[PDB]
Amino acid sequence: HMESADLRALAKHLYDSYIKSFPLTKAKARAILTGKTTDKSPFVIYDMNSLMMGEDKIEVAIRIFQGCQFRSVEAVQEITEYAKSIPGFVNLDLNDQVTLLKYGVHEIIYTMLASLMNKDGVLISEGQGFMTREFLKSLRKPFGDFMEPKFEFAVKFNALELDDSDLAIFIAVIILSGDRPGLLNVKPIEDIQDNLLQALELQLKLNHPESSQLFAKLLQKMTDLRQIVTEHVQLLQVIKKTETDMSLHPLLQEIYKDLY
């Protein structure tokens, strides 16, 4: 246990890093998804023709799939930058640094994807675009079904009503998982996470006092996260045996080589 002032200090630290590391915060995403801003209004893609006009303003299922893979790579870069700032992370064994990231980036991506989503769609191109869930759900053969459970998770997850400051600590807890497969020094990983959890517990208590057992309930959502990554990796594997024309990113190839 740390003194509560130390945890408050840790939380502020991490919020600052998160702000610096991720250009599109939940705070900015919500201001776009709600409205009353002629300054911030997205272009909305709901069919093939509006997609064709989307390029001029900012095969189809592949074009969209590949574009998602490059946004994903962009996010691993941002998450890796953030992780580097978590107190203790860079002092870990170098091999374990990779393993935490190998197993953490996806669970973090979906968490952060939820900030860019509502029941009806998802922000793209750094807020400038909005692609509707119904349009994606209607893409051919294997795709389309690739996007829907993220929406199903995002709707429930977003009802916790967390903000960027809450999320910064929650992301950290994810990265610092000492039960990831193949870690060499689990002990120093748990000790760090024991601090992030303490920081998160306090942060949640103060920022959401009317919201009973949010800490518990937020920890339970990592159950949902694990399954989404399972279903997703099973899906990517099918496209790999179906589409031999297209490829993955070197960085992406690494995250999904082995893994539970």
Residues making up the binding site: 69-72, 106, 232, 256
Binding site per annotation, positions for rosiglitazone: 69-72, 106, 232, 256
Query: Smallest distance from the beta carbon of 96 to its own copies, in angstroms?
Result: 11
**Among ligand A1IQ2, its own copies, none, residue 93 binds (CB under 5-8 Å by kind):** its own copies
For its own copies, the closer CB: 90 or 216: 90
Question: Exactly one of 5, 38, 39, 94 binds its own copies (CB under 8 A); which one?
Answer: 94
- Given a contact cutoff of 8 angstroms between Cβ atoms, the answer to whether 92 and 104 are in contact is no
For ligand A1IQ2, the closer CB: 69 or 211: 69
Distance CA 229, CA 181 (A): 15
| String marking each residue 36-75 x if it binds its own copies according to CB under 8 A | ----------------------------------x--xx-
* Binding-site size, its own copies (CB under 8 A): 29
Of residues 154 through 183, those in contact with its own copies by CB under 8 A are: none
User: CA nearest 170: which of 11, 19, 9?
Assistant: 11
Distance CA 117, CA 223 (A): 20
For its own copies, the closer CB: 35 or 182: 182
> Which span sits near its own copies by CB under 8 A: 27-35, 43-51, 76-84, 206-214?
76-84
Collect all residues with Cβ–Cβ distance below 8 Å to 107 and sequence separation of at least 6: 174, 222, 225, 226, 228, 229
Distance CA 69, CA 146 (A): 12
Strands 121-124, 43-45: parallel, antiparallel or unpaired by DSSP? Answer: unpaired
- Tell me what percent of the chain is helix, strand and coil, each rounded to the nearest 5: 65, 5, 30
